[PDB]
Amino acid sequence: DSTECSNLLLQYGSFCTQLKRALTGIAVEQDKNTQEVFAQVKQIYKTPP
Amino acid sequence: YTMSLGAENSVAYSNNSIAIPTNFTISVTTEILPVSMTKTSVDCTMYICG
Amino acid sequence: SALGKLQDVVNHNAQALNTLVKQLSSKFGAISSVLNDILSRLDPPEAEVQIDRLITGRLQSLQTYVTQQLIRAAEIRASANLAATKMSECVLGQSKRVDFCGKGYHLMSFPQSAPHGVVFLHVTYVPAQEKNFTTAPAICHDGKAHFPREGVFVSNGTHWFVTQRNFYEPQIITTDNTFVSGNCDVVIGIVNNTVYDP
Amino acid sequence: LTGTGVLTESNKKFLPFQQFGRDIADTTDAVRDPQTLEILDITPCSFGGV
Amino acid sequence: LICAQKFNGLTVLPPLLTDEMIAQYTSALLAGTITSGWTFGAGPALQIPFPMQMAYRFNGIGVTQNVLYENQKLIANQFNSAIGKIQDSLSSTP
Numbered sequence: 114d115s116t117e118c119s120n121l122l123l124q125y126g127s128f129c130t131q132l133k134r135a136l137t138g139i140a141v142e143q144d145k146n147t148q149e150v151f152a153q154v155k156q157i158y159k160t161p162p
Numbered sequence: 163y164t165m166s167l168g169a170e171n172s173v174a175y176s177n178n179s180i181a182i183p184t185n186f187t188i189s190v191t192t193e194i195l196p197v198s199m200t201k202t203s204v205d206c207t208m209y210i211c212g
Numbered sequence: 213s214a215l216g217k218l219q220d221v222v223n224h225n226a227q228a229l230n231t232l233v234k235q236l237s238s239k240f241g242a243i244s245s246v247l248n249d250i251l252s253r254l255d256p257p258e259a260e261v262q263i264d265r266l267i268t269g270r271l272q273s274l275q276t277y278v279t280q281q282l283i284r285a286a287e288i289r290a291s292a293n294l295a296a297t298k299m300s301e302c303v304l305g306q307s308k309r310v311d312f313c314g315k316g317y318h319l320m321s322f323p324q325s326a327p328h329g330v331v332f333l334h335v336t337y338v339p340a341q342e343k344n345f346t347t348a349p350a351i352c353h354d355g356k357a358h359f360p361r362e363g364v365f366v367s368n369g370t371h372w373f374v375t376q377r378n379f380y381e382p383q384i385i386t387t388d389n390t391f392v393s394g395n396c397d398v399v400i401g402i403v404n405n406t407v408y409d410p
Numbered sequence: 411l412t413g414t415g416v417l418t419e420s421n422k423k424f425l426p427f428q429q430f431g432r433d434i435a436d437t438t439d440a441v442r443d444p445q446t447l448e449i450l451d452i453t454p455c456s457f458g459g460v
Numbered sequence: 461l462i463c464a465q466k467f468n469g470l471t472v473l474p475p476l477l478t479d480e481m482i483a484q485y486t487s488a489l490l491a492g493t494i495t496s497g498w499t500f501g502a503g504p505a506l507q508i509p510f511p512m513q514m515a516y517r518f519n520g521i522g523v524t525q526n527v528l529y530e531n532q533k534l535i536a537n538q539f540n541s542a543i544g545k546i547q548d549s550l551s552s553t554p
């Protein structure tokens with residue numbers, strides 16, 4: 114949280130927009146992975162008593 | 163709202179009950195798949211030191 | 213968003229390219245992004261330190277672009293192999309693998325070319341109009357259990373019949389629809405109709 | 411503004427106050443002739459891998 | 461440490477599907493297999509008695525229909541026993 118340091122980043126490029134987008138894409142994939150494996154049924158079937 | 167997985171349904175299971183369809187439906191679904199991305203080439207000299 | 217999968221591929225590589233050019237503007241700690249300006253403002257003996265500082269941040273952008281491109285290329289390779297795998301199975305034949313080519317029992321698959329991808333039209337078979345019937349594992353006639361050669365014994369509630377599993381064509385229980393195996397005191401749940409021998 | 415390119419006529423309209431003219435990047439895709447105040451259309455020379 | 465995951469600019473996003481909803485998916489997937497065989501995976505779920513269903517699974521590997529029914533008591537005792545040992549199998553080997 115140093116203002117002087119942050120001034121060097123904005124001169125350094127748009128690497129962060131690449132990093133946070135990469136980790137956002139890696140985050141949506143994890144949600145998609147669990148959806149693909151498990152959400153294979155459109156209804157919740159119930160075992161008989 | 164809290165997510166709902168789907169319409170809860172209970173199957174009428176019974177030692178001696180069978181359910182057999184009397185009809186069908188020829189459903190034609192669709193599936194999309196990427197195959198090839200864009201072939202890109204770069205030139206270091208023309209890029210790094212124009 | 214039907215063609216979401218292909219659209220993102222066109223978006224990802226194009227936006228990755230647009231970041232790569234946009235990476236050229238950053239000064240990377242040097243005096244200016246335009247290296248012709250550096251060669252004009254500063255003298256050559258003391259312009260290398262600025263040029264070297266610009267080069268290090270510049271090729272590093274290329275290293276990032278190639279690396280993320282190699283990973284993305286591998287992802288497409290898996291996707292392309294999957295498409296090639298199910299082009300051979302779903303189209304050039306019929307697949308018994310459940311939910312591989314469309315939900316339901318698969319019959320056909322007509323591909324269509326799409327920009328940077330393929331689209332499959334899985335012609336599946338979906339049963340409907342299900343009816344609840346009373347079944348039985350086997351049918352004792354003369355003390356010998358009869359099991360259906362194909363399909364399942366089903367009872368409209370009054371008579372027994374044998375019909376295939378996925379469609380309801382009640383047929384009289386002959387001795388050609390069923391086969392005999394042993395006595396009928398060992399099968400749990402056996403009913404006792406009469407098997408019309410043709 | 412020093413660089414290398416194929417100077418050419420531009421149909422672009424540089425509002426009086428508009429001196430140079432970058433594009434969706436940082437490249438001076440156009441310049442106004444110091445003299446003759448003409449809108450040129452500076453474009454990179456046709457390179458390409460062999 | 462895993463208790464305080466915040467650290468310094470390091471946020472751990474929570475999964476969209478909670479462990480409870482995943483368990484609901486698995487349980488709904490179990491009840492489909494038991495009470496409907498495979499028919500629930502290819503359209504509507506059609507109930508079928510489990511001894512009858514497993515004869516169809518037997519018929520799909522080559523053994524005739526009647527092998528299961530004449531060995532239902534033995535097969536069930538075999539399955540039950542195995543599904544049991546599987547709990548201790550995971551416990552025995554960490």
Ligand SMILES: *[C@@H]1O[C@H](CO)[C@@H](O[C@@H]2O[C@H](CO)[C@@H](O)[C@H](O)[C@H]2NC(C)=O)[C@H](O)[C@H]1NC(C)=O
Nearest residue numbers: 183184185186187188189338339340341342380
């Ligand atoms: C199976 O379903 C089809 C439609 O999905 C039924 O065909 C319909 O039959 C009704 C008769 O009442 C007609 O009014 C419709 O025009 C038909 N539609 C089509 C698309 O053919 C068919 O009758 C059903 N089979 C059985 C045995 O009921």
Ligand SMILES: *[C@@H]1O[C@H](CO)[C@@H](O[C@@H]2O[C@H](CO)[C@@H](O)[C@H](O)[C@H]2NC(C)=O)[C@H](O)[C@H]1NC(C)=O
Nearest residue numbers: 345366367368369370371372373382383384385
């Ligand atoms: C169940 O068994 C059969 C199936 O329809 C029915 O018996 C039929 O009745 C008709 C009436 O004239 C006759 O052709 C025969 O007696 C039977 N023919 C068949 C085998 O179709 C019976 O009525 C049905 N009852 C129920 C409970 O549905």
Ligand SMILES: *[C@@H]1O[C@H](CO)[C@@H](O[C@@H]2O[C@H](CO)[C@@H](O)[C@H](O)[C@H]2NC(C)=O)[C@H](O)[C@H]1NC(C)=O
Nearest residue numbers: 351352353354355356396397401402403404405
């Ligand atoms: C199915 O029908 C057969 C034929 O009648 C039954 O066999 C006889 O059933 C009577 C009534 O219980 C017994 O007293 C006889 O001893 C049986 N004979 C034999 C072959 O042992 C049979 O019990 C019936 N089964 C069911 C499911 O009710």
Ligand SMILES: *[C@@H]1O[C@H](CO)[C@@H](O)[C@H](O)[C@H]1NC(C)=O
Nearest residue numbers: 161162175176177178400401
């Ligand atoms: C029949 O079904 C009931 C309820 O599902 C079950 O409790 C009972 O044991 C079954 N009886 C037999 C052996 O058919």
Ligand SMILES: *[C@@H]1O[C@H](CO)[C@@H](O)[C@H](O)[C@H]1NC(C)=O
Nearest residue numbers: 173174179341342343344345
């Ligand atoms: C068949 O019977 C069961 C049990 O009574 C019931 O749950 C099911 O809805 C019935 N199906 C039809 C098509 O009537």
